[model samples]
Target: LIVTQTMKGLDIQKVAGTWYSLAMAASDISLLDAQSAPLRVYVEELKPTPEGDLEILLQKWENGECAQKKIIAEKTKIPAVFKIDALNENKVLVLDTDYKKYLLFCMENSAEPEQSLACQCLVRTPEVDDEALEKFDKALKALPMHIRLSFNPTQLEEQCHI
Candidate 1:
């Protein structure tokens, strides 16, 4: 069984801002390897529509340039658990956050006999303190043993042009 929990009482306004990708781990090496150095994610906008759905503009660095994508994440009955259609119906679980300093999210998916898990750690700055690093490490340990995690210390540099 896949067990995961999302953050409660998350204020959409407070969480809307630019976040730097400090660390990430996934079962797919290709996706993990393709994450260029100095990766960043710009939460351009987050607004609620009349239907009570969230419209988000997400920008990220791709192939040495910035790329933008519009995503509509439906608010679920559970707080901080959004159903992202673009992500293959995988529920985005906001595991941890402080709004200003750091945020951790997990993509959880289970289909029949296979289960997949992917996690991303974002911070306001490119660098994270030891405490934050340790916190993330502990959270990642909760994932299943079948999921392999790769850590890229070099990508967590403080300085990057883009």
Candidate 2:
């Protein structure tokens, strides 16, 4: 699979903030075409630890509750690329972003003949325009064929409590 290169000159501090999961595509999760349950991700905090790792508080709304996970992403020699040992040594690449409107994260794990690849598209707001959706579709196409792309429209509801 041809993996897209990581974003250059990514300022970790600038990218640190509460970002909602506008849409996501994974190998296992099926994309919802109709409105479904709400799903969100909150990056409560991100700071560089003394040990050279990034301490992160990532919260997501799942199965009727808000679940939070503390992740320690080990910094790589190249900025914008981080390794999460807990996630089977998956590399988190800051694929592309404006740090305001949209952010794309690509997680890759090289284990076998078919490497695991997943990506999440985040936005400041849940409601995304047609242009944005088109852009996301184009980017997702670059992923490996084994990884199916799906969408959850119900997460965009304004009344989504979580």
Candidate 3:
């Protein structure tokens, strides 16, 4: 009997660059709202490694200050270093450092200074599209009893812009 393995999606190195962290997890909690968060911006550079996988140097920044810089993820010798499985005109989803099995979605958000609040959504690879919404729904359904909510953007005063 003969057996063969199917190749995975495209590598993700060529796609490396300054990507804003749209969302992140702190323990089991996934935090959103990049505008107010300190470490909302991320920059990555990919280099070819002797090993089959590409080496990535990841630097995270907050409010124009350096927060953390470290080597993050890996991909193969393909022209594209990291795994870029999905893409739209303005967004692309790539894998994390470990390459265990997850893709992080990086999006191009509002560019207008008035709309400068950078909002990003983070979801698992399988949950990249509509499936990810289900994950969010589950999170909402299991809301902790002590949860408190505040700040409706519509009601926010113009002073916030100043």
Candidate 4:
């Protein structure tokens, strides 16, 4: 499989702001084609801590309601790669992010070899950006697994604050 690189000259400060889940692709999530309830996630903000770790704030749909979720993505020596220590998710890579219009996150779970890889495209607004979408297309095609991607129109009860 071909490995992906994070954005060049990455600045976490620029990425630390509000964004919405514009689209998502996963190897196991089954997408909406023939699926159950999807994990509706909306990114609220990305805060970089003093020790180079990142705190991700999100609004996640669970038990029929949107709940606030916070997960710390530990910083690595590579700087672009982050380690997630919860759930099946083990790592997150910044596949691409212009920091102004859109951001792409690539997450994978090494423990659950079955359905643990996902690609997330978050935009500054609900309105989709063609350039971002195009970049997403390229990344999707380059991935090595059989995957399905979806666009989120129902951002799931708005971007919640905690």
Number of the top-ranking candidate, with TM-score as the measure: 4
- Residue 143 deviation, candidate 2, in Å? 1.1
Query: Per-residue alpha-carbon lDDT of model 2 for 1-162, expressed as tens digits?
Result: 345767788877676656555656654333222123222344444566655577767665555556767878889997878888854567778777787777777666766655656666766665655555566677778765333433354544423323
lDDT tens string, model 4, 1-162? Answer: 133657777887778877777777776545323322344456777888877788999876565566788989998887778898754547788888888899988777665345456777788876767888888878878775455554555542245311
Local distance difference test values of all predictions, in order: 0.60, 0.61, 0.31, 0.70
Rank order by TM-score, top first? 4, 2, 1, 3
Cα error of candidate 3 at position 141, Å: 11
For candidate 3, write residues 58-162 as lDDT tens digits: 444444544545543344353323332223212122322223322333222223222111122232231234433343333333222122112222312212211
Name the TM-score of candidate 1.
Answer: 0.69
- Leading candidate by lDDT: 4
lDDT rank order: 4, 2, 1, 3
Tens-place lDDT digits, model 1, residues 78-161: 767777774357677778788878777766665535565667666666565556566677787776533333234355442332
The TM-scores of all predictions, comma-separated, are 0.69, 0.70, 0.30, 0.81
Q: Candidate 1 — which pairs collide?
A: none
Candidate 4 segments whose C-alpha is farther than 4 A from its true place: 30-39, 87-89, 111-115, 145-149, 152-162
lDDT of 2 at 32: 22
TM-score of 4: 0.81
Question: CA shift at 4, candidate 4, in angstroms?
Answer: 2.4
Whose TM-score is higher: candidate 2's or candidate 4's?
Answer: 4
Q: Model 3 segments beyond 4 Å from truth?
A: 1-7, 26-52, 59-65, 72-162
- The residue pairs that clash in candidate 2, if any, are 31-150, 31-151
